[PDB]
Design a protein around this ligand. Structure first.
Ligand SMILES: CO[C@H]1O[C@H]([C@H](C)O)[C@@H](O)[C@H](O)[C@@H]1O
Ligand SMILES: [Cl-]
Ligand SMILES: [Cl-]
Ligand SMILES: [Cl-]
Ligand SMILES: [Cl-]
Ligand SMILES: [Cl-]
Ligand SMILES: [Cl-]
Ligand SMILES: [Cl-]
Ligand SMILES: [Cl-]
Ligand SMILES: [Cl-]
Ligand SMILES: [Cl-]
Ligand SMILES: [Cl-]
Lengths: 213, 223
């Protein structure tokens, strides 16, 4: 029944900044709080336990503070190595609970996605499958919504998204959404549309094509 | 009245792992040596593994030794079979079976059996990708920029690598993280943006390498 609340969920900053991440407990947890760092596709790494004790090997620019119901992770002098997700955790003898994570990224200005759509190749079509690809390129922040419409019927359950890691040169993200249909289903309809919603777009942008034209 | 039930099963690619469990009803496993047995497609039964009370002795068929592990949980009445580095010949129906009799002795038959779970090991440990163009058009133009790419579909396992023009084209390339499809195979796209004015002035070729299957594919993307 202890619930941990982490704030903010995304934190955008620059190299050299000093940043603070907050974790609050729904009831007092003394100093039974840990902080983990996690990079994409890797295991979480313990940084701090008992609220303020650094694990051996952890650089002193990380520091943990707090007790009772309010805890802080401070990173003093952000380095490239520090862009990552940070998780707080209450740990007890026989249970644990985590905060929702804070993803620390590089700050930049809002950038609308450029949107691109690709009909299936004739080669793929021959083999019985139609992959329709919508690309959202070089946008910021990472939050974005893509909806597929086929003859104005909203699609569900038949698309998959992939997103890049933050770009090392322009600090943007890109995203692919791929709609997969059987050749039979693909040939039943005419208009294929990718509709994109993003903070940098005043209204949503739609790229479409007509099958065969 | 006594029942056993296996969980886990299904398809595994050669070289893969799969873990089975066995649960029971109306008896406690603690008193019994527990076994895994399999029925191969030709119809015969093969003893797989045995685990004694308190786990003191674990024994395995020669064919699975070093690849399979049997464990037991006496407090909650479960038996486990870990299967690793799986081979086509592991394809079988797997049963958990109790060694027992009406009055327990030093050597009883298998008096109770689960209904079985089917395990299929496909011969292909790897599968090279199919590569399709993402062709540039007026629908993949934004401002003075065109996008093109390659869809790299239906490979296993990860990873594939993708370059453009044998490494001469790197600016404006994004190769997305692979996605696992419901088919059990991976797919990703690699895209590149270029000035719309450069279309027709050169070729674009994606060079796809799938080390696990020793497959290399070069795909030209036009117009
Ligand atoms: C201890 O008794 C158990 O183990 C015996 C042998 C030693 O496997 C077996 O014959 C019995 O049925 C029972 O499973
Ligand atoms: Cl280390
Ligand atoms: Cl991250
Ligand atoms: Cl656009
Ligand atoms: Cl762009
Ligand atoms: Cl996909
Ligand atoms: Cl079978
Ligand atoms: Cl009997
Ligand atoms: Cl029986
Ligand atoms: Cl098969
Ligand atoms: Cl570059
Ligand atoms: Cl290769």
């Amino acid at each position: 029944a202890v619930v941990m609340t982490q704030s903010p969920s995304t934190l955008s900053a620059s190299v050299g900044d000093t940043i603070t991440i907050t974790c609050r407990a729904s009831q007092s947890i003394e100093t039974w709080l840990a902080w983990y760092q996690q990079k994409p596709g890797k295991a979480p790494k313990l940084l701090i336990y008992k609220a303020s004790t650094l694990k051996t090997g952890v650089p002193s620019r990380f520091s943990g503070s707090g007790s009772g119901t309010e805890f802080t992770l401070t990173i003093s002098g952000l380095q490239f190595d520090d862009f990552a997700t940070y998780h707080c955790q209450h740990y007890a003898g026989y249970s644990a609970t985590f905060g929702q994570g804070t993803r620390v990224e590089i700050k930049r200005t809002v950038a609308a996605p450029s949107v691109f759509i690709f009909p299936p190749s004739d080669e793929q079509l021959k083999s019985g499958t139609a992959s329709v690809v919508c690309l959202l390129n070089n946008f910021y922040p990472r939050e974005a919504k893509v909806q597929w419409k086929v003859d104005n019927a909203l699609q569900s359950g038949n698309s998959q998204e992939s997103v890049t890691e933050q770009d090392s040169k322009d600090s943007t993200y890109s995203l692919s959404s791929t709609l997969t249909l059987s050749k039979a289903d693909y040939e039943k309809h005419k208009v294929y549309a990718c509709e994109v919603t993003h903070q940098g777009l005043s209204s949503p942008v739609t790229k479409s094509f007509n099958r065969g034209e | 009245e006594v029942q056993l039930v296996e969980s886990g099963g299904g398809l595994v690619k050669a070289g893969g792992s799969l873990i089975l469990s066995c649960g029971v009803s109306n008896f406690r496993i603690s008193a019994h040596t527990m076994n895994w047995v399999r029925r191969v497609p030709g119809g015969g039964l093969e003893w797989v593994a045995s685990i004694s009370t308190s786990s003191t002795y674990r024994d395995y068929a020669d064919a699975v030794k070093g690849r399979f592990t049997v464990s037991r949980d006496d407090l909650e009445d479960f038996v486990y079979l870990q299967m690793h580095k799986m081979r086509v010949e592991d394809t079988a129906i797997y049963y958990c079976a109790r060694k027992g009799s009406d009055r327990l002795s030093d050597n009883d038959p298998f008096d109770a059996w689960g209904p079985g779970t089917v395990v299929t090991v496909s011969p292909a440990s790897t599968k090279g990708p199919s590569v399709f163009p993402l062709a540039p058009s007026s629908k993949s133009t934004s401002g003075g920029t065109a996008a093109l790419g390659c869809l790299v579909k239906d490979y296993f396992p990860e990873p594939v690598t993708v370059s453009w023009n044998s490494g001469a084209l790197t600016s404006g390339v994004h190769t997305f993280p692979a996605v696992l499809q419901s088919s059990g195979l991976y797919s990703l796209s690699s895209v590149v943006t270029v000035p719309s004015s450069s279309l027709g002035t050169q070729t674009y070729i994606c060079n796809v390498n799938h080390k696990p299957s020793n497959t290399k594919v070069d795909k030209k993307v036009e117009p």
